Design a protein around this ligand. Structure first.
Ligand SMILES: *O=P([O])([O])OP([O])(=O)O[C][C]1O[C](N2[C]=[N+]([C])C3=C2N=C([N])[N]C3=O)[C]([O])[C]1[O]
Ligand SMILES: *OP(=O)(O)OP(=O)(O)OC[C@H]1O[C@@H](n2c[n+](C)c3c(=O)[nH]c(N)nc32)[C@H](O)[C@@H]1O
Ligand SMILES: *OP(=O)(O)OP(=O)(O)OC[C@H]1O[C@@H](n2c[n+](C)c3c(=O)[nH]c(N)nc32)[C@H](O)[C@@H]1O
Ligand SMILES: [Mg+2]
Ligand SMILES: [Mg+2]
Ligand SMILES: [Mg+2]
Ligand SMILES: [Mg+2]
Ligand SMILES: [Zn+2]
Ligand SMILES: [Zn+2]
Lengths: 647, 648, 223, 222
RNA sequence: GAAUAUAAUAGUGAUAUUAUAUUC
RNA sequence: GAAUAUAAUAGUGAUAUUAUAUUC
RNA sequence: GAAUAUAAUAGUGAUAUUAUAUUC
RNA sequence: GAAUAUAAUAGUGAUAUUAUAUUC
């Protein structure tokens, strides 16, 4: 083995005495070793005639694989059978038998949730020690919090069995919407109540050792103003008012370009447009479809304005060109040809402006400055760059590759499902420990306190730096308050460590009883009338609510050979074997040049069936006639006829 | 059991004597009982230490089912096991054990062919009796003759195995293209050679009994005058420039409204797809335009023909349906242009389809006939035969679209009711309702079909009208009526021969044909290892490469790689069949814009879900030279054919 | 192919859930189509890597031939090999081979009894569904009861072989020498135990449909 | 991962279902051959059936290595990979661990003991067996014992569905043979020991194999 | 030839007799 | 999807086109 | 396909829209 | 502790001794 650091022993200590401990320590100080310590001690604690059963909850699959590997190779030599159950290997298997025949089990929490609800696992008394990776997640309706709901429901009751010790691991417990230390302490106590925790473990005695292991990178604030003059926006504005005029040639207008309020307004406008009714129901299709294409088009224009605001004009122009070309590759329409022909008119001027040197972004200029300087002082620099969207990932990557100034940069991509600089959208929690970046750069990217603290893990080496480039003061302040909330966090934790076990446990039990009472006191009318499901783009008859069958009380399919004529299929670009289903292809509308995303086509059990989403269908009651729109399927209450194999 | 006819015993007598014989009896005199009698005698002739094994050959599934049920219901009581194997129940089952563990096996011939070729069934020595239903099909490359090729190849060889007795069943052996009796004689001898028959059994000493059961319907010939042009001087110019705006693109070196015009448009269309162009981008535009133009032209031709044979209203509704489907398959500038030109002149029409002034005299003659025959007998059951499947519901809508024929209840028979409209039934087939009236609307086939059609009305008083506006049809029927005489006379002449002499003439012909077939084998392909690019035929978009194409069971062709998966779209198959070890899951079309040209189908082969394509939907470009060649069949396209391997 | 009565679906419902079921319905309601539905659904329920094997038990030869005919005509199209073995075609034939190589097998019960006793058929595990026509004969030592004796003797013993679902078809289970209610009930329970049944399917919801298809004839007594 | 060609050439006979003795120089990469064979074998069964692979390693380091690889590789595709060694074998239900998993890595002595104890009915529960260092399959070695069970069930009256056998080695040996024919018969005896019908060797991709694994020059000092 | 079931008739019954039907 | 047959048409023919039907 | 979380924006908020990420 | 393999040395060999290594 290897000699463990003293602060790791210090963090493991509260948990090794058998207390439900939330361990809060810096990202990358070696929490895995602590986990192995606590687990080893826990399993060694039991006498003859009984062997403990530990379970480790990991949120993401990489963490699942990592921890499963480490735990296996570490503990198998000591005679402890280690297993793991992920989403893939959790179907058609006796999960109960797998749990009982193993000492250590690495799980994703959704599995245990579904197993508890299904009843395959009776209670959590089977376990002796539950560990929560990224514990702080155990709030709201997170799977962690569901497991803990079962735990507390079993605890808070006369019929109580032997419950397992609950250990939590995190780098930040968070403080929520707190503005002062008291509210923060309240939030932290609520979290400890969520985990039935009585002790918060932080490094106190061996602080300096930890300060020589993990380092806090110096953070810098880069406030640059917007682009001075935008000819691009001056063109796209006019195009969008021409599109707005094309759309206003039909209906009433009941806002600023390049804004988010506009992006919401166009959504509500489109949603309101696909409700429009006509006795013809033929020209209605043309009007609604046009009022879909217009909306979507000027929406793409808005997106292009945002991209233009956060990157090169060439990036936005390439976004528009990409969009219109993908529209051109997928059939054609009179409206589509119209708008396109309108766009290519302004295209030449647009690239006359885009290929102009004076039309450069200062926000990218300062980034180029920081990159040039930091790579000049140290040409062995490993950079990471966080941005909001994927469009900005591609744009910044092409900007890096297409810049004489930055010919020393070999960019890489880290987008949700070697090099010098990685370009990523966001990473949930800490995740699998990646290569060390001595330069973190936040490009219009600011999250909460927990994410801020976790981000320090990227550069836990001495001399690491973290810049924050923005053209919005609200961003700067939003990052400023996070540090104050971290202060409030550590101070609240430090005051909470002064309390004695009795008082804290009493408070915890009190709170637990409180939201248990909230949950229990919390806990419908299906109109069996038939309704036509129409295409949200064509207003054409897709199906009927009677033909719709519901699988697993979550998924929805259509019955009859009548529906098979209404859609078309294209082999799924990203197939997946989720639950008891297997994605085979995507399903779109079939009426003329439409092809609107209706749903997918999957293999389920012994049937090849089409599954739809109500987010792309209009519900029309035949009697009343009025049309309505629904997002979640659960909002659409009706006679949900269950699925039967005899049809 | 049931008391049989005497002519049945007479027909079954040469077969029961153990001689390979062809039975020629009028349609519907009960050949089933003959089969049952022959089988019963053949099975119960054997001793105790030996057992017989009979195999029956039905060409189609209805006959398969019927014969299987009858044989099983009749022979089980006698202690014989009867089974059947068709294409549906042929997969994943040991057919040799099914054959061995049974006494009577009803088969579709393709099953036995495939099993013999594969090797699951060693030889035909297993059977002691083979019976061919509609044995007139024993010729050319038909599965029957494919079986008899095996039979003879074993017979005409040093390898000697106990070969089964061969019985044939038909109402006509045919005469081929014989101009005289001595040629028809040679044809019949050739057929008997193909079936290794030494006897031709017909009714003779009991004809007086037979002719009181099967009555020959009287055959009236109705020659009518043609239409005299409310739909001719309208679509004429339409065709004229719909050809010439295709000529606007390029010059291309023949009366309109005919079949020759169809062939012309077809070959032209198959000559436009190979227009190599350096621009490539607008090559797609040109080809996708010309394809649409020709596709409109030929269906215009179809409308013209339909008008020439039926109502003009249906000739309109045809085009209306066509443009409806075109508008439903996505709107194109060219398509909406031709559609605009069509609907511009559509106002002139429809009104023309609404005048009684221009009504097809053929349909009026048909109305006259039907009204007459249903006046004389209201309980008349009429069956009608048309050339194409287009004229079926055309004549149907003509019937109910007429108050004069309000006493008619049309029925359909293609792929309760007074009249049944149909295309063309293969052979005798499963027996349907007995008809008192048979009408042939421009429908004349071979002599065998003529003789077999008499089975539709084998009762007394049955009639058959041949309604046509062409003399060639009439003469084509008369030559058949002469061919029947030639056949019967040749048969009666052969029945005077000595059995031995006939046997050696048969043997002679057999050896001749065997030598021919043996020497017919040839060095056919030198596989081109050069990688060829397969493009679409309509929009000329790149479909795939020859390196990606795999061949399955030396017949079908799939595409590997994830590259091709982004080249096509799919919609659930209209008629989901199940052929071989496959299963039609859906259809497969192009993806380049709304081209939507049919490429093939998407099937479920074992544990794979794969695309299967037909070469007649693609253009074979050469990646090296650029010579765009076309192939109508996969076997005509010789290239480096790599057998499908699950390893991939 | 078409228009099944709703009471037929109601009767086939418990058997389409794998439950061993005795079906009790008036004579002439159409038990054949019920058998066809149950059997069909039983066949289409198996995945690709697995297959089913249904066996029908007819007590008489005419019923045998009729059922074999119907099942053959109906399931040939779908791709199921249907065969039959009676006393006339039972000698000098490989019953193991005939049973395996077919998906649906129609038998007279004495055949199965004899071939089980001989050892030619090892166990009933080869079957996935057994249907009994006139299942009220499952008593004393009628061939049905012997077959079920083998079934039970494999069930209750140490043998853990996968036993097939059991369906019975009758218009009257009988009461025997019962003189009151809970005697008749005990008799019926004894019969259900003889057939390993746990569900007795009868018409309850679609009575109004059935009573318009099958009429009870008025009875008279002339002394 | 970017595979080599000779690996595919070595795996191909095994993927066709034939029992195969793969003989290739040490260091060529038999691991990816194992992974490929296992992947193709498991992802070939229909829905109504499932595959069960068993991997035999004679040493604990090789055992934990292979277990690590197979677990980190087949978890994604949806196959439960587990391992049994001398440490964990005691006081555990073996047949349950075997049936509840798709890929089972173990030392041969384990399976021998559980076959002798009768806790496992037969090898029919497996569909693919893979002997690492299959040259050990001789004499009283555990490999040859397992194969003795296999052959006893094979040549016996019983007709249970037997798993296909893949062996992995760099040498098969020739024993105390003097000429090529005795060596041939000994090799045939080894093939009979593993019920193999094909000996996989690199042929059409030697130019690459030599580019990968080189042969060291030898010197003799007397 | 044998087996099986239903019914009537005597015995408390094991059953026996006859009738009827089915099966191998 | 593939194979086979029949009919018409172009052709000296091997063939080709279309129509129709069947089978695997 | 569905569920969960984070952030921005509208709203008093329960919520809603968008973006992002994850899970089954 | 037990089982197993490789090598050398004895011997006709089954085997034996020893060395080395592995596994349970
Ligand atoms: O088309 P398949 O490959 O699935 O095979 P099949 O049996 O239908 O062959 C029939 C031929 O006719 C054409 N076809 C097929 N479908 C489904 C249609 C058509 N033609 C029209 N006008 N409408 C159809 O729906 C094919 O070319 C095929 O070769
Ligand atoms: O599309 P599915 O119904 O199979 O579900 P999903 O898990 O794959 O989620 C995709 C959903 O997000 C939207 N979406 C964005 N982008 C860029 C894509 C894409 O490239 N391909 C697909 N199929 N969907 C995309 C969709 O709205 C979808 O619902
Ligand atoms: O016993 P068998 O070998 O004779 O065969 P079987 O089953 O057909 O006969 C059964 C018994 O019935 C008797 N029996 C024959 N006949 C013609 C009659 C009859 O007409 N009426 C009665 N009441 N019995 C008959 C046979 O003698 C045989 O014992
Ligand atoms: Mg085929
Ligand atoms: Mg006997
Ligand atoms: Mg789900
Ligand atoms: Mg021991
Ligand atoms: Zn639509
Ligand atoms: Zn195309």
């Amino acid at each position: 083995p290897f000699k463990p650091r003293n602060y790791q022993l210090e963090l493991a200590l509260p948990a090794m005495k058998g207390k439900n401990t939330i361990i809060c320590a810096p990202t990358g100080c070696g929490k895995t070793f602590v986990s192995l310590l606590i687990c080893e001690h826990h399993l060694k604690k039991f006498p003859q005639g009984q062997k403990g059963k530990v379970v480790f909850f990991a949120n993401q699959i990489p963490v699942y694989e990592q921890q499963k590997s480490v735990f296996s190779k570490y503990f198998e030599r000591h005679g402890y059978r280690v297993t793991g159950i992920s989403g893939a290997t959790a179907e058609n298997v006796p999960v109960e038998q797998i749990v009982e025949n193993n000492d250590i089990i690495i799980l994703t929490p959704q599995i245990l949730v579904n197993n508890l609800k299904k009843g395959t696992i009776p209670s959590l008394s089977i376990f002796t020690l539950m560990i929560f990776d990224e514990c702080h997640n155990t709030s709201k309706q997170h799977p962690y919090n569901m497991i803990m709901f079962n735990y507390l429901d079993q605890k808070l009751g006369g019929s109580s069995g032997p419950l397992p010790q609950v250990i939590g691991l995190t780098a930040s417990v968070g403080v929520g919407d707190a503005k002062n230390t008291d509210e923060a302490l309240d939030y932290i106590c609520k979290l400890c109540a969520s985990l039935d925790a009585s002790v918060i473990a932080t490094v106190k005695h061996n602080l300096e050792e930890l300060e020589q292991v993990v380092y806090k990178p110096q953070k810098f604030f880069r406030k640059v103003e917007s682009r001075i003059s935008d000819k691009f926006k001056y063109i796209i504005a006019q195009l969008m008012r021409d599109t707005e005029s094309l759309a206003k040639r039909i209906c009433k207008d009941l806002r600023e370009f390049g804004t988010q309020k506009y992006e919401q307004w166009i959504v509500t406008v489109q949603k309101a447009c696909m409700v429009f009714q006509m006795p013809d129901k033929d020209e209605e299709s043309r009007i609604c479809k046009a009022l879909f294409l217009y909306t979507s088009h000027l929406r793409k224009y808005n997106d292009a304005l945002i991209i233009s605001e956060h990157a090169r004009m060439k990036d936005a122009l390439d976004y528009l060109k990409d969009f219109f070309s993908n529209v051109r590759a997928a059939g054609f329409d009179e409206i589509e040809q119209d708008l396109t022909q309108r766009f290519e008119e302004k295209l030449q001027e647009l690239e006359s402006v885009s290929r102009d040197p004076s039309n450069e972004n200062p926000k990218l200029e300062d980034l180029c400055f920081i990159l040039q300087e930091e790579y000049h002082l140290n040409p062995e620099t490993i950079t990471i760059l966080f941005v909001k969207t994927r469009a900005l990932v591609d744009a910044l990557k092409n900007w890096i590759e297409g810049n004489p100034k930055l010919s020393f940069l070999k960019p890489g991509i880290l987008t949700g499902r070697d090099h010098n600089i990685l370009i990523a959208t966001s990473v949930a929690d800490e995740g699998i420990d990646i290569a060390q970046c001595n330069l973190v750069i936040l490009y219009e990217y600011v999250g909460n306190v927990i994410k801020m603290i976790q981000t320090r893990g990227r550069g836990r080496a001495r001399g690491s730096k973290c810049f924050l480039l923005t053209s919005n003061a609200g961003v700067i302040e939003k990052e400023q308050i996070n540090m104050y909330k971290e202060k409030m966090m550590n101070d609240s934790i430090l005051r909470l460590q002064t309390w004695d076990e009795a008082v804290f446990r009493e408070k915890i039990l009190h709170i637990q009883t409180h939201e248990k009472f909230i949950r229990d006191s919390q806990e419908p009318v299906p109109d069996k009338e038939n309704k036509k499901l129409l295409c949200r783009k064509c207003k054409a008859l897709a199906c009927y609510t009677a033909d719709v069958r519901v699988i697993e009380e979550c998924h929805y399919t259509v019955l009859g050979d009548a529906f098979k004529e209404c859609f078309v299929s294209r082999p799924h670009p990203k197939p997946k074997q989720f639950s008891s289903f297997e994605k085979r292809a995507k399903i779109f509308c079939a009426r003329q040049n439409c092809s609107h995303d209706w749903g997918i086509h999957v293999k389920y059990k012994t049937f090849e069936i089409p599954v739809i989403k109500i987010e792309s269908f209009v519900v029309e009651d035949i009697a009343t006639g009025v049309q309505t729109l629904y997002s979640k399927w659960k909002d659409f209450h009706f006679e949900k006829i269950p699925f039967d194999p005899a049809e």
